[PDB]
Amino acid sequence: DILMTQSPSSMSVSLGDTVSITCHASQGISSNIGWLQQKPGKSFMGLIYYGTNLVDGVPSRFSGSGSGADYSLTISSLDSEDFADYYCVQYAQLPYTFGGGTKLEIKRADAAPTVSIFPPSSEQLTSGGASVVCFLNNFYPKDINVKWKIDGSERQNGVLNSWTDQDSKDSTYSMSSTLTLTKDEYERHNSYTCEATHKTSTSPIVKSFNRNEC
Amino acid sequence: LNLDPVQLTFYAGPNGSQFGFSLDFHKDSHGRVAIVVGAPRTLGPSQEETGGVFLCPWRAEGGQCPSLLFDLRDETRNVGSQTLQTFKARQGLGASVVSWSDVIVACAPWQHWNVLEKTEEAEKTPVGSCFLAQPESGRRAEYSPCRGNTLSRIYVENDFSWDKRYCEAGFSSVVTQAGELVLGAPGGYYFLGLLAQAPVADIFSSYRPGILLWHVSSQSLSFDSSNPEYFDGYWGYSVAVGEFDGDLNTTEYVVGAPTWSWTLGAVEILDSYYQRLHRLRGEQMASYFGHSVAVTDVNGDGRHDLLVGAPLYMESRADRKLAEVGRVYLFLQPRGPHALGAPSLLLTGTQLYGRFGSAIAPLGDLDRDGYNDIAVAAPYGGPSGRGQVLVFLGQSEGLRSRPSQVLDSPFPTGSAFGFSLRGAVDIDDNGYPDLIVGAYGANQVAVYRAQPVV
Amino acid sequence: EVQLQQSGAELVKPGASVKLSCTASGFNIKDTYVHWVKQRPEQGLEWIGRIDPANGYTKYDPKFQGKATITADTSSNTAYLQLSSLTSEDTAVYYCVRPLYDYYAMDYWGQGTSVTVSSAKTTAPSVYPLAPVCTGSSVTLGCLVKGYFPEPVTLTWNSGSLSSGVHTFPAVLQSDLYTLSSSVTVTSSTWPSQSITCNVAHPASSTKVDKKIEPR
């Protein structure tokens, strides 16, 4: 099969910018390439076919170019609706193969996360389980790391993370981490911590609580 | 009657190009009339015959014409694990030309096409192709509705049904007043013959160079058949349009099928969905009834009439002998919804092998008497066999039985003077419609200007 | 206009079989190729195969040989994707695609059909309040929704009242069941002064439980 190496994985830019996605193929495909758009939580829309031809109904700020095995999609002067996912696709050979994808994200000044740790609930503990929740809200850039420590020692088994898309108002991301222990193992220990590593601080932002203690 | 045979105008093309094989009038965006001439054996870039088109400005002195340029290079596309190729050698570009609005449509009926997939192939076959140009803007487009990418093995397994590989699309062509291009393809469906229609606007807007295989969603093709009467009938050898069902919102198609039903010949009138409204059967086998058709109201009742050329009709003569002279049939359209009856008039040639009826050109109202007139070609007629064009004037009962004027060929023997004809347009703006006659054997076109009635 | 209206979201068990539909509106499905594409967040977009509804001929990616079966009925102007011997890995959204002009392109896309394979039963969620630990100017509460199936759920603070400054997070599959959480941020003067409530509705099992957040 033919590998479609689409770069970059994502990019942070602003309205009015002139950005350019690229797509490299494992061999010459002679302009038999299409470009797609997937707006968040929605289906697809064709942009380019045969390398340079606009699908009917597409603004002219979109444009395609390239030859051989290297092609590029360019968006002159970004609009607000242009922040979505984009894929290249080859049809020079069967099977058709797609690129990895490229998410266009909103650029803004860095922001540090607001950490908050929540001990297990009284109702949940009486059922036999114990879940410590840690919320990391409103930060930028998207890259972040969460580390769970029980009695000062790192813990990796039983964690469950979840992220949100770039918020519409402030262009910040947020994260939810959940450690789930049995009630019996939750009480063998006392300290419970979630560490947050972000580029907005060399020192990891820490929040914790001791069991029984308040 | 009042065409001037003394002061002619001659346009000429390259030797051996068959300049004059087809022609039509062309009005630019400002209403200026020119002549588009096809030359289906003009040499391409590789010194090989490919065909060509010429756009002749109107000059009373005639002369040479500039070329209307089209891409003559063979094309190759590797896509979908296949190889598409077009072959323009000896394609015959300009075997038919037609004009509508400010657009010229020139077709290459014998352009070949094949598709390669590993060891298999679609087979190199003449699907034909038409080229579209807007001369003032330089816009270009193509239309090839019979290209396919099915491999040869599939047609064999399905008994060659819907086999569009030998279409020769563009063999005949015509454009409706609304802008619908209609192509005749007499080799369609394994030589049964088909029609292909699409709006000129949608042909332009859906075309991009290098695709070779694309969709024109608004197009509509005729249908295959299991009836042996249609086998090898060359349905689409000639095409025309007119109003025949009373409803002025629908355009009806007229299709010639000169070998229909074991070479009996036939002409059919259809609606734009290719459902049949009437069928005119040939009178004599191998006479090529349907070789040519034209639509014009000759008796001034506002209802389009129909004439059919049978250039090889053999007239009965003394001592149980037959003489190939050709014949033209005229069918007057009856009032309201009724069938076209028996022929109203039979015009029969005189010179042996003259092929009277090879072409039939509506002239409009030549003598300005209120009735439309026609010109019939006998490209090998006349006392010398050099070719004649005979003019017949309209009247209240149809057409005159005798010609008002005969035009003898001004060219040498073998020019096929009259093989192509086109009238009903005033090229010099004198108020009278004129007549352009092609003589592809001499690589020339002659212009006959109409004058006030003497 | 060219529109591709696919069938509704499916929910099936492993080993069973499902058959999706793609109906052509505004055109004849016989006109062009019709492709099927599978989308997963990690693996991305994968091409299943194509059918030419004019003659029923098909092509397939060898990765899907056996599981995928593409058919088409020109009568109802509809194409089909049948999937057999389903698996966890066969959980994705499926699109039908056709070209605009170029015979081999991929320009028009259906809305997409969601498929979910699971042996899980209809299980109701378990709402838990999340109060902070024994200070600043801002205060953040939360709510936990654990162990329900299938999706989705609607979560609202004070029944649509408190809306701004709220984050509800996408559900996550935790061993055949889903889990979701939502946070909410106000000022220190607001709480525990005013009574904030987590409103969780799960229509599948038809439940609307609500927990009030109590401090510690």
Place this chain on the structure above:
Amino acid sequence: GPNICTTRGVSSCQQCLAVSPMCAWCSDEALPLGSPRCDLKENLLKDNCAPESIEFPVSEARVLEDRPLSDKGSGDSSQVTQVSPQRIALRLRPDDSKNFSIQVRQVEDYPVDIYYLMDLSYSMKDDLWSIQNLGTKLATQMRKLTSNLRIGFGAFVDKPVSPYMYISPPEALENPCYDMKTTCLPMFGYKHVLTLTDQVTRFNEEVKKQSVSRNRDAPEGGFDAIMQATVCDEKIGWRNDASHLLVFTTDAKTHIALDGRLAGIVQPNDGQCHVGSDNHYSASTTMDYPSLGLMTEKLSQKNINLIFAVTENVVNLYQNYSELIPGTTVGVLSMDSSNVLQLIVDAYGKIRSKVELEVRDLPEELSLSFNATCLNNEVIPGLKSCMGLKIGDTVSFSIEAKVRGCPQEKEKSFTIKPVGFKDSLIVQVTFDCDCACQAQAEPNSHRCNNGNGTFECGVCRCGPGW
């Protein structure tokens, strides 16, 4: 009494004879003033007219050549007689008529040429097998009817050009049967194989080396082959004094004139020979199929009797063509040509079962009428063609020649010939409108108004210029 010879009042001898075929003129000096000189010949001798001065020519008809009809067409360098008489002298006076006779015989043991023109497209593969002994088997059966048989062979497929011909891949051009599991010849239009010869085993051995080809469309280019087999006299080898049989065998429709435009061919068929030393038809890819009219002209010009030997599925088609090509015979061919021998023998009998007369170069002022004697001495008025005949039968016709007025030219000759026959009857016609006394007149005679007139035949005529 007063007849139309006198009551009409003539002025000269010439004017007298042109009144009625019965009038006579008396060129004698001794004749009463009131008595006429233009009367019935009886009434002239009744009035003492010197018999030598009587001008009364009589319409006659005497034979010049009168060879007897042959009994056997064998032997001779075509010293055979099948029409008798071969030349007569006809003489008519103005508005008169005279009758004469002609005998026509279907001579026994007449030489025969048979050129076998065969469809060799793919469906005739089995036909080739069943005719590998035809040359000898046919020689056996024709030996009962003629001692001078010559046979030949040619084959056709169609115009070797797209779209009739498969042109891809390159292997298909050398072997059109490549995508099957066989080998066939490359496509050929028309090839001559065997010039007419009496060595019949040349037919068998040539046919055994023949094989079929293959093309795309059902109609085939057989009419191209019929034209070349007709106009290439020397190459096919027709004899000047033999019945020419052209056997055309096919199981399919045929291309016709104006079909070639699907191959880009628009040039009309010129009706000339284009088979060179390679024995292939060299204009196949550049010249259109011939029309039925042009085929008729050449067949009649070369005396070729065309035989459509076709299968049941196309017998109606070719029966309808044969009605447009008079003189053409049709027979039903089996799906493997196994019955072609009896087909040819019955076609030859049908060809020689008719005697149809033809008139050439008949003057405008001459009209002819015919009474036919066919079968057994039965007269059939107004008929010039006998049918239902057998080899050796003889028929006869009674012709009457009536002339209207008297023409300017006094000597013309025309021809009576049976359709397809070599022999003919040459009728030399002389128009006897003058008097021999006119070739001895006195220009500027003293007795005629003081030299103002001319004296001829006993009367004074006004001289030239008056």
